[PDB]
Amino acid sequence: SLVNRKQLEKMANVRFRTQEDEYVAILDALEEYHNMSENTVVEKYLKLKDINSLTDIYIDTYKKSGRNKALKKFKEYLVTEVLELKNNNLTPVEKNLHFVWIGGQINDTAINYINQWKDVNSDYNVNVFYDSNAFLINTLKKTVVESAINDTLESFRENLNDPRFDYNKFFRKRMEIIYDKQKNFINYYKAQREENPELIIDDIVKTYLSNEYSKEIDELNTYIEESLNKITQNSGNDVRNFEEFKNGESFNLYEQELVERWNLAAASDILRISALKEIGGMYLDVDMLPGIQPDLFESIEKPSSVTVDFWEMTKLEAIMKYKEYIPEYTSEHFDMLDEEVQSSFESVLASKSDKSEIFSSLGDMEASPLEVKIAFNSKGIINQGLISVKDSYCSNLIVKQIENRYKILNNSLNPAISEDNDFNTTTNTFIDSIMAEANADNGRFMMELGKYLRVGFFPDVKTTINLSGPEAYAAAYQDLLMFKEGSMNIHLIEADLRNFEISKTNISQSTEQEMASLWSFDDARAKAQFEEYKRNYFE
Ligand SMILES: O=c1ccn([C@@H]2O[C@H](COP(=O)(O)OP(=O)(O)O)[C@@H](O)[C@H]2O)c(=O)[nH]1
Ligand SMILES: OC[C@H]1CN[C@H](O)[C@@H](O)[C@@H]1O
Ligand SMILES: [Mn+2]
């Protein structure tokens, strides 16, 4: 409970020192805060913000004041009061589950995962967000990348047996060709948009694919039809009917990632937070599954011979092996267990008849109007799981973080692209500008932007997490606890972030599909795909 006016007067007391206007401003504001019983949680937080600002105004005005020590202690009590305000005043979470699949046909694997959530949360409305205008982005990315592969491997033909022509050389040379093909498409998209602003993304994409890659417009229309029909009868919710998002400051960023960068994870990052802000509820990646009942595998001890991650995977594999809720779910990890351990799993699952005995239900959830709750793995916070009440204060802060982060990026990126040079020259101008504009505040953030042009086309490029992903969420939490906006220097520790954790029992994160990233890939996969592309091209 935050100190009252009398308690602060005692802390900041200085014998025979004038009560300065700036000091009385603080005391008045603190007194007002303690008479705000019947005000909203956000109103109370905005008051605590004022009190913090007024306290800073004082310490800045009277630099050598005997009050300053006690006022620095008071600024700490304000932060504790934000957390107490967040933990003790909770409203219901709107019973919505938000999924996103944009850029192409939703796979049966995605639907089968979504259906688990539906079966165990019959009291929840389910939105599977799609873009009715952009069903051909994934077909465009795949066509350009496969053509870039063939163009690269052909350039390798003779100097092939040479170990200098490794997987690293392949991806560097292929990137140059992907960039040229990207620029060609973006230039066509813009040309078509000035000629006829009525044309939608899929109109332009399918005409581009007909012109440049001899694709049949009739086949592409059939694919759109089948994809639109499929999502239509799986709780489909059209982005092109989401007016608040379309009229907002983030839609140009969403289309930047959808249309120019072909990064559907980045576009998903921008959409999911808008959905939570405007509607409220819980966002889940299509690779997440419901929480396993805590008591289910209580009786089965984890072998020392197996990692924590291995064990969490085998739990889901066990369920799917014996209940077959998701057809052709892997048993790769379960099948490595000793027969006695496999038997323990079978015997437990044989004693369960209903899915509600395997997976838990979200039920009535409540959160602070201040907060967006976020999922955790061993590496820290991850936006694959998000809970927020409609129009939460943090949902607003996170939108503003993403918008500010893209402003800094585009400011350095757009000049470089406008010079209309090759990938290396463009990369060089971009990084020069990044390092030029970097300061003490945004230094760390700027050092992560360098690979933006390569996202999805080159191994171990994770730029998106700094722009639209987890780092935006960490920054938004810092904004809340520091009574400010626009944090770039993240100094929060685990203990701070853990106040915003989603309970581990609400999501099963260790799924088969979670282990296969859709927008990034590591060295292991790079090496593997290179060899796969080589034997395919020369047989
Ligand atoms: O073609 C795509 C690829 C990805 N996504 C979205 O991107 C999210 C994150 O993808 P993934 O789980 O592969 O990211 P990771 O967990 O590997 O960071 C998914 O849940 C989808 O909402 C999409 O809509 N279309
Ligand atoms: O921010 C980009 C991705 C980071 N990993 C998350 O699981 C995924 O949901 C995001 O799209
Ligand atoms: Mn994932």
- Taking the chain, what is the end-to-end CA distance rounded to the nearest angstrom? 73
For residues 515 and 525, give the distance between their C-alpha atoms in angstroms, rounded to a whole number: 12
For residues 213 and 404, give the distance between their C-alpha atoms in angstroms, rounded to a whole number: 37
- Angle separating helix axes 339-350 and 308-323, nearest 10 degrees: 50
Tell me the technique behind this structure.
Answer: X-ray
Out of 382, 402, 509, give the residue to mutate to test ligand 2, the one with the largest number of ligand atoms within 8 Å of its CB: 382
For residues 178 and 150, give the distance between their C-alpha atoms in angstroms, rounded to a whole number: 11
**Residue 266 alpha carbon to ligand 2 centre in Å:** 7
Query: How many C-beta atoms surround the C-beta of residue 340 within 10 A?
Result: 7
- Residue identified by tokens 């209309």 is 420
CA triplet 465, 471, 475: central angle to 5 degrees?
160
The DSSP secondary-structure symbol of 258 reads: I
Ligand 2 neighbour 461 (Cβ under 6 A): no
Resolution (A): 2.5
Separation of CA 162 from chain center: 41
Q: Whose C-alpha lies nearest to ligand 1, atom 2? A: 264
Instruction: Report the amino acid identity of residue 443.
Output: G
For residues 159 and 150, give the distance between their C-alpha atoms in angstroms, rounded to a whole number: 15
Query: How many C-beta atoms surround the C-beta of residue 63 within 10 A?
Result: 7
For residues 478 and 491, give the distance between their C-alpha atoms in angstroms, rounded to a whole number: 8
Tokens of 250: 């983030």
Residue from 319, 375, 296 nearest 512 by CA: 319
For residues 142 and 136, give the distance between their C-alpha atoms in angstroms, rounded to a whole number: 10
Out of 374, 517, 518, 520, give the residue to mutate to test ligand 1, the one with the largest number of ligand atoms within 8 Å of its CB: 518
| Cβ pair 42, 369 in contact under 8 A | yes
Query: How many C-beta atoms surround the C-beta of residue 414 within 10 A?
Result: 11
User: Is 285 annotated in some ligand binding site?
Assistant: yes
| Cβ pair 394, 476 in contact under 8 A | yes
Instruction: Report the amino acid identity of residue 91.
Output: T
**Residue 310 alpha carbon to ligand 2 centre in Å:** 22
The H-assigned helical ranges of 214-366 are 217-232, 243-247, 251-255, 264-279, 308-323, 339-350
Local structure of 167: helix, strand or coil: helix
Tokens of 401: 């973080």
Helix (H) or strand (E) holding 112: helix 108-120
For residues 372 and 369, give the distance between their C-alpha atoms in angstroms, rounded to a whole number: 8
| Cβ pair 416, 437 in contact under 8 A | no
Which residues 6+ apart lie within 8 Å of 507 measured at CB? Answer: 284, 288, 289, 290, 291, 375, 384, 385
**Residue 468 alpha carbon to ligand 3 centre in Å:** 15
Phi, psi of 337 (to 5 degrees): -70, 155
| Cβ pair 201, 240 in contact under 8 A | no
For residues 162 and 164, give the distance between their C-alpha atoms in angstroms, rounded to a whole number: 5
Phi, psi of 97 (to 5 degrees): -105, 115
* Pocket (CB within 6 angstroms of ligand 1): 100-104, 138, 264-265, 268, 285-287, 384, 517-519
